[PDB]
Every structure is written in C-alpha cells, then in structure tokens.
Write an enzyme that holds these catalytic residues in place. Structure first.
Site, mmCIF file in Angstrom:
data_model
loop_
_atom_site.group_PDB
_atom_site.id
_atom_site.type_symbol
_atom_site.label_atom_id
_atom_site.label_comp_id
_atom_site.label_asym_id
_atom_site.label_seq_id
_atom_site.Cartn_x
_atom_site.Cartn_y
_atom_site.Cartn_z
ATOM 1 N N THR A 221 0.820 -1.204 0.000
ATOM 2 C CA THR A 221 0.000 0.000 0.000
ATOM 3 C C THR A 221 0.858 1.260 0.000
ATOM 4 O O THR A 221 0.417 2.319 -0.446
ATOM 5 C CB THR A 221 -0.951 0.021 1.217
ATOM 6 N N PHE B 108 -6.690 4.887 6.368
ATOM 7 C CA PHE B 108 -6.031 3.955 7.278
ATOM 8 C C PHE B 108 -7.013 3.249 8.209
ATOM 9 O O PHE B 108 -6.625 2.743 9.261
ATOM 10 C CB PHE B 108 -4.963 4.676 8.104
ATOM 11 N N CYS C 88 -4.952 1.312 10.916
ATOM 12 C CA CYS C 88 -3.598 0.895 10.565
ATOM 13 C C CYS C 88 -2.580 1.142 11.675
ATOM 14 O O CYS C 88 -2.428 2.263 12.157
ATOM 15 C CB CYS C 88 -3.137 1.602 9.287
#
Ligand code: HEM
Ligand code: NI
Ligand code: NI
Ligand code: NI
Length: 460
Positions: free
Chosen positions: A268, A393, A400
């Site tokens: 990512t 995120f 994340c």
C-alpha cells in the site's frame, strides 16, 4: 425516518455477482455508487453487504460501540495466507489483542526514530539506481517503489536484506505474494470455488504459499544465528509477552505476523508513492511547489528525522494522493447489535457494511465540487476536516498500526526524489489502475534527469 435500500441489477441466483466480473471491481463499485448514491445493497450467493459512500453514514459506521470490524469475503480468503495475523483476525478472537499489545511498542515514536536510519539506507539505494541509469532508459515506477518498500519493512522490521535493487525481476516473494493475492480477489467471483476446474488454482496457491513460508524460514533462521541484541518488530515478536495474559505469541502465530507485516507493510506504501509521483507529473505546478520545499528543507547530504517531519507540503501531496486513490480501497464492519443507520436503514445484528473509501473521499458535501482535481492545499489545515471524512487507514483500535511508518517513509523518499531529480512524463501515461485487492497504477513509466546533488553516507 425509514426507507428502503437501492440495489443494482440482479442476475437470478447469482444476484449481483456478475456485476463484479471484472479485474477492476473496486472501480466498478464506484460506477454503481455514482448511480445509486450514498448506500446500496450488494447480494451474492450466501452473502449480503451494504456499500457506504457518504461521510454522513460512514461517520456513524465508525462508532466502535455500534459497529465492529468485519472480515469481508476478501479477508476471509486472505486468511488462508495470513492466518489470524493482525489484519485478518477478528476483534474478539484475540490472538489479536494479544499481538496488538505485544507489537504496538514497535510503532511507538521512540521506535520510529530507530527505523529512520534504516529507511535512509534503502532510500539512498533508490536514488543511486536512478542516478546510474543511461539516457535512453525509462523508470518503471511501481516496480522500483515496490523494491524500496519491501526492503524497508524487511530491514526495519526483521533486519533482513531482500536486496531488491540487486535483482532483475521481482523477488520470488513478490511473485508468489501477488499471484496469491490475485487468487483471493479472483475467488470472489467463483459461484463454485470447489469445482475441479479450479484445481490448478488450488495447486498454484499452495505452492505460492510454500515459497512465502520458506522465506519466513530464512528470516527466523538468520535471527537465531544472532546479531548481538536487537529491538525491532521481530524481536518483540519472539520475546514479548501480552501484559493481560502474560503469554508470548504462539509459534503458529509469529509466522502469520511476519507474513502479515511483510505484505501489509509495503504493498500500500509503494502504491501510495506510485500514485503520488503520478499526480505530480500530471500537475507540474504542484510538483514545483513540492520540489521547492524539498530543496528548501533537505540541506544535508542525507535527511535527518526532524527534517522529514518538516516536509509539511510533501505530507500534503501524500494525503491528497491517499484521498483520490486510497491504496487500501475498502474495509468492512458488522453491526454489534440491532440498530438503525442514518435513521433510514435498519440493520439486524451481524449485518455487514463496506466502507467504500474512494467514494467517501469524493463526497461533494465535504470537499466541494472539485473532487476529481488534485489540490494538496485541502490538507493545509487538518483541524478543518470533519472526522471520518478521510479514512485511508481504517478506523478505531483496528485502524492501521503502520500508519506513521508508511507516511514517514513515503515522505522521506518522495523528499529525496524531488531534491535529486526532475521528472518527465515520457510516455504521456494514461492512468490504468490495477487491483490485487490493493490499488496501484500499472504500466506507469517516467524519465528522471539528475540535478547532480551528491549524497553522503548512511547511519546504518
Ligand atoms: C499508505 C499505506 C497504508 C495504507 C493505505 C494502509 C491501510 C490500512 C487499513 C485501511 C487498515 C485497516 C484494515 C481494515 O479495517 O480491515 C490497515 C491495518 C493494518 N495495517 Fe496498514 N496501511 C498502510 C501501511 C501500512 C504499513 C507501512 C504497515 C507496516 C507494518 C501496515 C500494517 C498494518 C497492520 C498490521 C494492520 C492491522 C492492524 C489491526 O487491525 O490490528 N500498514 N492498514
Ligand atoms: Ni425520520
Ligand atoms: Ni523512451
Ligand atoms: Ni508556471
């Protein structure tokens, strides 16, 4: 109050499944959101889910007391690769909380200062690769960004050097990983996954995983060959214990976390850097302003930790790239109990929601009418943005864990890229976004002219 939910074309028992008969399904869920609006129902054999697109509804969905993280059918398949690792395990199944507590120190800000020197080690390698090209040669951007991000998490996280800039084709890990993730995405369209027609797919997959695991074997082996002491992600993995239970990580689970972090920690980020560099060469006045900040701040041979954090506008370029195309384009949630969303759409316990992140970021009632346009200046003031309007995120205790890791690296590298090079859209690239669950622009190629600014040494 209450009203019924729109639903796209159905095809008999297959329901909405044929709509996703494309190798670009997220961009297709976007075609549908533009049609039906902020929410719509998606049915397939043995699964229903609601796709959300507005900040209004999504703001409610991020209420952790009402909604919990769901494993989408995608993640359920990825679980065959990553097991009950941090990304693919349930919130109440806690080899999660166990691993969360154990690993969260490795992303403490005292830990970030430790990684930086190693992040520069790989960043220098990238710059030197480009400064050593011949004038007739192109740069394959997503290919080289992948070399940069894999090697970074490999070094910072496990003190293992993939040495990707010493390699022609991608590392054997990458080939297996990409193919195995393509399988997880593609399997979402098979009405009969266990038809023997997919036996060749099942056989390739078990071999791809065989390859990924024999690399994990290398990482752990080299580790027990010692290298005095270390306190990186792998050390805390092997020796840390969960304060709540006093237990270390299961042997079966330490392996799942390595796989998790090797994959989750780079696909990512390279996607982000490839999308960022893409937008810069398509908006040169934005590229100029960013390059000017790069030149103004990065005055030493190699960037310091403080200097990276001073690249505010380079951070804004990144966030805006994450806005237009979040490289992790979706996450799932389930209703903890019966409830009503947006006071219009009633939900039963255990019902599934999909947060369509690219459409959230195109909500005109938050961002203006100029949604498709690339203006970094939207993030000039963070305080402005409503909460849950920008979610590249994820959300909550299961957002994340590597968010600061990704952005620090990306800013550092993008910083050094602008300091040291000019960039030419050599092929006049037409954006072609490839989906392997994650997003990246495929075929993207640029040309770099060196500004002839020397580099120094490396701390690590
Ligand atoms: C631009 C880069 C990145 C993006 C857009 C991104 C996106 C996300 C998203 C959306 C989630 C939540 C998944 C869900 O809710 O289902 C997530 C979780 C996670 N990410 Fe990232 N990520 C990035 C970089 C990284 C990096 C560099 C690492 C390095 C270790 C990492 C490791 C993880 C882990 C372990 C989780 C699961 C944590 C948990 O739920 O307990 N990610 N990421
Ligand atoms: Ni009402
Ligand atoms: Ni050419
Ligand atoms: Ni001008």
């Amino acid at each position: 109050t209450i009203k019924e939910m729109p639903q796209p074309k159905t095809f008999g028992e297959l329901k909405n499944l044929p709509l996703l008969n494309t190798d670009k399904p997220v961009q297709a869920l976007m075609k549908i959101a533009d049609e039906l609006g902020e929410i719509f129902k998606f049915e397939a054999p043995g699964l229903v889910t609601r796709y959300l697109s507005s900040q209004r509804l999504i703001k409610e969905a991020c209420d952790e007391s009402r909604f919990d993280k769901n494993l989408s059918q995608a993640l359920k398949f990825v679980r065959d690769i990553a097991g009950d690792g941090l990304v693919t395990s349930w919130t109440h199944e806690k080899n999660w909380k166990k691993a969360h507590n154990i690993l969260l120190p490795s992303f403490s800000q005292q830990a970030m200062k430790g990684y930086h020197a190693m992040m520069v080690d790989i960043a220098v390698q990238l710059v030197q690769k480009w400064e050593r090209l011949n004038a007739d040669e192109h740069i394959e951007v997503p290919e080289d960004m992948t070399r940069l991000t894999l090697d970074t998490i490999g070094l910072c996280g496990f003190n293992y050097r993939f040495n990707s800039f010493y390699r022609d084709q991608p590392h054997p890990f990458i080939t297996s990983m990409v193919r195995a993730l393509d399988e997880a995405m593609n399997k979402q369209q098979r009405a009969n996954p266990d038809d023997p027609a997919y036996d060749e797919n099942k056989r390739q997959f078990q071999e791809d995983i065989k390859v990924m695991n024999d690399l994990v074997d290398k990482i752990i082996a080299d580790r027990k060959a010692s290298g005095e002491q270390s306190d990186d992600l792998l050390t805390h993995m092997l020796n840390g214990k969960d304060p709540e239970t006093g237990e270390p990580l299961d042997d079966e689970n330490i392996r799942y976390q390595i796989i998790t972090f090797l994959i989750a920690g780079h696909v990512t980020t390279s996607g982000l850097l490839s999308f960022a560099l893409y937008f810069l060469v398509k908006n040169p006045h934005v590229l100029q302003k960013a390059a000017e900040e790069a030149a103004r701040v990065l005055v030493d041979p190699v960037p310091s930790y403080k200097q990276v954090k001073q690249l505010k506008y380079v951070g804004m370029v990144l966030n805006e790239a994450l806005r237009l195309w979040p490289t992790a384009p979706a996450f799932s949630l389930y209703a903890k109990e019966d409830t009503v969303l947006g006071g219009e759409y009633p939900l039963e316990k255990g019902d599934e929601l999909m947060v369509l992140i690219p459409q959230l970021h195109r909500d005109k009632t938050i961002w203006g009418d100029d949604v498709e346009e690339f203006r970094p200046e939207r993030f000039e003031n963070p305080s402005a943005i409503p909460q849950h309007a920008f979610k590249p995120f994820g959300n909550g205790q299961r957002a994340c864990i590597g968010q600061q890791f990704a952005l620090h690296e990306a800013t550092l590298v993008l910083g050094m890229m602008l300091k040291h090079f000019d960039f030419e859209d050599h092929t006049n690239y037409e954006l072609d976004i490839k989906e392997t669950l994650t997003l990246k622009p495929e075929g993207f190629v640029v040309k770099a002219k060196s500004k002839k600014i020397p580099l120094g040494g490396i701390p690590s």
